């Protein structure tokens, strides 16, 4: 069916890009969305029209679900899907011209079949291949020891929780730190170096690559309520090594719960 | 005898510990020191030792303060004076083997001359030389744009101030990252992807490097109140771009300041 050859292609588009990139930093432009906070610039734009045009030229039957874009359009009952965020940490790529990430998905009625979080940054690609595993330039990755949220580090948006909730989390793990990517504070606890990340209110490709490495790499992947995300939809979302995700949905659901109130 | 020649000495003692650090992640062992989160690994003393016995053998009349040994001999009298923090952040050298750094300054007659922050996981040697300048992996650093604090993401321990204070800091500026190593978090305020970094309880040894490097690169380091810092005797401290330096200092502190209990 071949999922290797297809990644081939994806990696080769990936390669591509990493020359590309530098030209679209040569000429940024920034824009607001919804409101100050909130970004896009030409790389999220470009970047993303790239692999749509490489997706019609190379899979025309394959649909994409990409941030900068409409997704009127994107149903229940489609065969194979791409799901895109071109640049995840476009707040991080502005301020800071390091740690964003490209993230891409593809569902096979479904079900994540590949997967990839590229560390622009750092080149460092992250990828995911149903029959393979998981690989970080090339090198296999293995399920990380396991992490009781004593001894891990958590990563999560503070400001967008009631400050009860976050001194609980405080006081229940080993330390708090942020890189302010989904993709990226992801791929830390993929690797082991924290024990969770929580996004309260993510969109589907901050989230989309993600499944498939929690699957192989046996994290726990979930709602805050420990069900099944909807790939197509977000929902308030975990990332977790498997010793500490309970621990941390009971706390954050605890004491009426972790929305801010004021 | 030059500043150049101290230099060039110390980047080849710093480049030549590439080779030594990987072995000892590698034979990794942890102690505690004045409570359980506190924590000593045998990198941290190697390297000390290592840096000590390199002092030892060039420049025998100069004296080190640093973390992992007692520093009762001082005054400010001592003419030749290094500071150096072998390892600064040791939490995320054992729970990620990234994110941490090697800070050393080199201080005569009390005046910074030499300073550096070694980011060893990303290869990334920043140093500062009185005279010549400050420098990246030997790529020239320059003063920051301009930042002012609701355009500018700030770094600090959350864990410490009292979340009152916290969440003033969120709402005044543009968003929060946290790296979790002084010396790194520090270079993230001279290169310009932070507005500001605090640390409400500094060692000499965490901050020592940054004197030079605020010096050079026209970065604010003070106080809490804005006074000089003692090199000697740390200090709670800020790190700031100089547009955002006023309004930090006077969020922290409004209303009876920024501990706990105000
Ligand atoms: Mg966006
Ligand atoms: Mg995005
Ligand atoms: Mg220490
Ligand atoms: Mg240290």
């Not at 009631?162 to 990226?184: E, H």
């Amino acid at each position: 069916k071949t999922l290797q050859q297809i990644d081939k292609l994806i990696c080769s588009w990936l390669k591509q890009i990493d020359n590309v990139i530098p030209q679209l930093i040569m000429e940024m432009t920034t824009e607001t969305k919804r409101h100050r906070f909130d970004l896009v610039t030409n790389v999220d734009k470009q970047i993303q029209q790239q692999f749509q045009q490489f997706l019609a030229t190379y899979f025309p039957e394959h649909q994409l679900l990409a941030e900068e874009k409409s997704n009127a359009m994107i149903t229940n009952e489609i065969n194979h899907l791409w799901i895109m965020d071109p640049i995840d940490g476009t707040a991080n790529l502005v301020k800071q011209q390091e740690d964003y990430c490209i993230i891409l998905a593809y569902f096979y009625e479904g079900k994540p079949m590949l997967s990839y979080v590229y560390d622009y940054p750092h080149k460092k690609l992250y990828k995911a291949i149903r029959g393979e595993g998981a690989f970080c330039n090339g090198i296999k990755m293995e399920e990380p020891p396991s992490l009781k949220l004593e001894d891990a580090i958590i990563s999560f948006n503070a400001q967008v929780m009631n400050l009860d909730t976050v001194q609980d989390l405080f006081d229940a793990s080993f330390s708090y730190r942020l890189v302010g990517a989904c993709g990226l504070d992801s791929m830390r606890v993929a690797k082991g170096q924290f024990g969770a990340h929580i996004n309260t209110n993510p969109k589907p490709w901050d989230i989309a690559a993600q499944f498939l490495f929690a699957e192989l790499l046996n994290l726990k992947m979930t709602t805050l309520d420990g069900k099944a995300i909807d790939h197509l939809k977000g929902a308030p979302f975990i990332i977790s090594n498997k010793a500490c995700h309970e621990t941390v949905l009971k706390i954050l659901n605890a004491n009426g719960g972790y929305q801010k109130y004021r």
